[PDB]
Design a binder for this molecule. Structure first.
Ligand SMILES: COC(=O)[C@H](Cc1ccc(OC(=O)C#Cc2ccc(OC)cc2O)cc1)Nc1ccccc1C(=O)c1ccccc1
Ligand SMILES: COc1ccc2ccc(=O)oc2c1
Lengths: 257, 246
């Protein structure tokens, strides 16, 4: 029965809204230009320096540190959302930890896309907007850390997915049977089918004109995995290059593999 | 008319049954007996045996925390069922659910509980009251306070149907801190109180002022929740998983 699938989608969207402070719609409104929400934009060091006045060590490191603290915030929100997903809590604790560890970074990048536009990415709760170039400008090796994300962001954004569509999609990502170190795959696999079934109906209903959106969206997953692998490689260089720099413990634990 | 209250009462009962895997009647049948006896842990060995059938002090508490998380999701599904809960401001729904859950968990917990022991693993196993009491502080005290409440609360002899309305009343609480709008929450709560009152009289005509007595309990729930959090802070003083339970 579709109603069951529709109801499940409704639940996920509801959980998605409560779980995440900044929705895609809110981000789009600030970016679209729909006065109250207008974002201070950092395109230069002085603007970044200025940003402190109205927005919440080394600048390249400080900015990289900002993401690490923010990622921690995302992990907490994703983790909160993940519990919402029907039957995720029920799964074996190790599997819950394993799914979240592998799943979280992919979701963050997907979720990040909502903030991003070819020019820049929203920061500090949408209070400020950071230019893509400025992040690109960052001194090696830290400069091309958001360059991969931006590309995924235009390509993925192209989809034009609404928050409701995303909430189911993030759910599918988290509940992935094919995760290294899983004790039970079958319980996870069954849940994903429901998410997959719900997502498929949701896209058709939501984006009737769009064709093979489900297939196109599912393809996106390969890109997310590629991005995560690239980031880990980049992270490895950062640690050796910067002995002094410190990584968040929660973030480090996810990193270990 | 009155039919609406009865309609509401049945609707909550159906939602309550669907929402929760294990019911007081189902729990009752196992403690009373009626079809395989739950594995019983009275000893450290039995608990070790218990894991396979289905450190010492710390691990058990985690299971309760793990179970609680399951309860919150189950409660959330049932909470949605309640008429007009979904319509409420999303911040309010989160606030009612957040503050509401602990009181409901203990109330739900009570149905499983008997003076001697509390059921676990969906009635698969029974943990002896004495064994829980034995556990090294702060853990030894932790369960016992719940047992005392359960015995007194169980005294009412409420049926699952009575609980379902009662559970809705707890969730729909105006007092909760940070509510943006309370007119809708109190107005819905008022209707549920009306439904609960009618349900008790019909379901328990012989009982006198059962409604008032049930309303009285809430004070018990608030103190128990107050106690559990206070003990919990003390527990703190001794990875990703933290995030889950939080
Ligand atoms: C270690 O954690 C990570 O994997 C993160 C992934 C990530 C990427 C984006 C993200 O969300 C955000 O986009 C954000 C944010 C943010 C928040 C608060 C803030 O004020 C202090 C400032 C901010 O820019 C959240 C997480 N990436 C980084 C981690 C550390 C340092 C830099 C990054 C970058 O992604 C990065 C980035 C701009 C150049 C170069 C690199
Ligand atoms: C999963 O097994 C458990 C372990 C611990 C508890 C503790 C409280 C409870 O109500 O139910 C439980 C169930």
């Amino acid at each position: 029965e579709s109603a069951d699938l529709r109801a499940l989608a409704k639940h996920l969207y509801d959980s998605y809204i409560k779980s995440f402070p900044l929705t895609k719609a809110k981000a789009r409104a600030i970016l679209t230009g729909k006065t109250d929400k207008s974002p201070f934009v950092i395109y230069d060091m002085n603007s970044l320096m200025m940003g402190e006045d109205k927005i919440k060590k080394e600048v390249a490191i400080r900015i990289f540190q900002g993401c690490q603290f923010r990622s921690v915030e995302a992990v907490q929100e994703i983790t909160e959302y993940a519990k919402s997903i029907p039957g995720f809590v029920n799964l074996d604790l190790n599997d819950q930890v394993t799914l979240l560890k592998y799943g979280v970074h992919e979701i963050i990048y997907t979720m990040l896309a909502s903030l991003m536009n070819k020019d820049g990415v929203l920061i500090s709760e949408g209070q400020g907007f950071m230019t893509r170039e400025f992040l690109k400008s960052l001194r090696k090796p830290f400069g091309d850390f958001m360059e991969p994300k931006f590309e995924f962001a235009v390509k993925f954004n192209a989809l034009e997915l609404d928050d409701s569509d995303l909430a189911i999609f993030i759910a599918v990502i988290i509940l992935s049977g094919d995760r290294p170190g899983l004790l039970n795959v079958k319980p996870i696999e069954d849940i994903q089918d429901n998410l997959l079934q719900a997502l498929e109906l949701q896209l058709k209903l939501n984006h009737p004109e769009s064709s093979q959106l489900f297939a196109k969206l599912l393809q996106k997953m390969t890109d997310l995995r590629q991005i995560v692998t690239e980031h880990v490689q980049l992270l490895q260089v950062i640690k050796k290059t910067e002995t002094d720099m410190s990584l968040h413990p929660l973030l480090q634990e996810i990193y270990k593999d």
